[PDB]
């Protein structure tokens, strides 16, 4: 087609607002202020092809997984209406963050104004996924201790809202602060160490291991840490500049660690609801 013809450009001729990683040298999209050209670039080979397809395939995966969860029979749930709500809040954060991300990566090359707008949606999305992750996971760990459950959901929301407001800062999006963005969102997720230690103290090592929690969360902690470490230090494109332009650069694998980490997270809290269904809502444990 003869409409909106464009070629990939090297990194040195890019405008300022499009230089986010100088280790990717060739294969960038040039600035094109047409959404039509941006959305058809999804089927073109460039630096953002993997970044969009990873979180667009992941967005429909958790969308369909989220609707199957709503139509599962209430036969298997101790409180089907509010159990499907806490899970839906996790699915709400998961879908919004993956949709904000692939949309941002698609319209990244449109203009400076559109780029800054969808970048703030991109950063706010990951906070929503972190807060949404905490809701079904807390409502089960503190099932019989309601007041620790309700303070810990207040502070993760005051932290996630603060993380969303700090993402409205413009120097947040600069490449000089890529280590600052790494620690802010990583400290958001690793803030759960305080509710986890509270849970182990009151329930015990055996309880935490029998129910399977300490195994699934150190998987979560590893995916959290490894994903943030690759992003902040730009491995492997830091080692091979100019050979990871299209496939397997840091941002691409970080996207994969988010889809896998959110699915691993769903697997853990879904186990916590099958374990609750077997012992019921009654509570005389002490």
């Amino acid at each position: 087609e003869f409409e909106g013809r464009w070629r990939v450009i090297p990194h040195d001729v890019l405008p300022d607002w499009l230089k986010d990683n100088d280790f990717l040298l060739h294969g960038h999209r040039p600035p094109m202020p047409s959404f039509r050209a941006c959305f058809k670039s999804i089927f073109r080979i460039h630096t953002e092809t993997g970044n969009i397809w990873t979180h667009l395939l992941g967005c429909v995966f958790f969308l369909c997984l989220g609707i199957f969860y709503m139509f599962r029979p209430n036969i298997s749930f101790v409180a089907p209406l509010q159990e499907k709500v806490v899970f839906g809040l996790f699915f709400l954060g998961a879908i919004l963050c993956l949709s904000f991300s692939w949309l941002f990566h698609t319209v990244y090359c449109h203009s400076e104004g559109v780029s800054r707008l969808f970048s703030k949606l991109d950063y706010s999305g990951i906070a929503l996924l972190i807060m949404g992750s905490f809701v079904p996971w807390l409502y089960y760990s503190f099932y019989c201790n309601p007041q620790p459950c309700f303070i810990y959901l207040i502070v993760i929301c005051v932290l996630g809202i603060a993380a969303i407001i700090v993402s409205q800062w413009d120097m947040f999006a600069t490449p000089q602060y890529r280590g600052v963005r790494a620690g802010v969102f990583l400290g958001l997720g690793l803030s759960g160490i305080i509710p986890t230690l509270h849970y182990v103290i009151s329930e015990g090592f055996l309880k935490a291991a029998t129910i399977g929690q300490i195994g699934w969360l150190m998987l979560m902690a590893s995916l959290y840490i490894t994903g943030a470490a690759l992003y902040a230090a730009r491995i492997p494109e830091r080692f091979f500049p100019g050979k990871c332009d299209i496939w397997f650069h840091s941002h691409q694998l970080f996207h994969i660690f988010v889809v896998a980490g959110a699915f691993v997270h769903f697997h853990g809290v879904s186990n916590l609801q099958e374990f609750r269904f077997m012992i019921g809502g009654g509570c005389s444990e002490e």
Partner: antibody
Amino acid sequence: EVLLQQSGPELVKPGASVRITCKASGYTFTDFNMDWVKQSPGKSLEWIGDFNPNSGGSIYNQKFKDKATFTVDKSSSTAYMELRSLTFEDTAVYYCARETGTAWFAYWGQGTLVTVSA
Amino acid sequence: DIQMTQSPASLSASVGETVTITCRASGNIHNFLAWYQQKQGKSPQVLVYNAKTLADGVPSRFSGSGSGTQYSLKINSLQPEDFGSYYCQQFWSTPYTFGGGTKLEIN
């Protein structure tokens, strides 16, 4: 700095041929597309076509399909344009102009004046 | 083919004044527009590309705007060196096309 230097003025007779050479330097030649622009005296600019040094393909304006032919020599980073069977209508200043992803022209040659006269 | 209609064809203004060169495309060009300035006998130089992005080294008094089929080039506080011809260009559809041009004279 990126510079586009093309050949000097040509004085030819009707029915003859000319080849204008645009020599580019200051960048990797295959990375960007080269376009050609015609400007008749006192008139505005007209788009002749675009040439891609990487693939070697070219897209011609229908008006200049039977008039222009784009060639290239990647060893010397030179673009060429052949004009065939020239008439008095082909008296103009011909430019080369380099794209940068999309076909907006940041760099231009100084221009080659082609004068047809018997 | 997309037709580009530039207006006015020519105009003369004093130094320090503001001038506006309008331009209309026969079809939607999706902001794939560029403006150029050409001095007497010299080569044209790009002023604004992508409808609004100011090119490197171009003074801030030049500003491009518009969307769809109606675009505009504005020159605030005219300087003596601003005389010459001005052209618009669309690069959304092939064959790419230029406007008729606008001759600017300073008094």
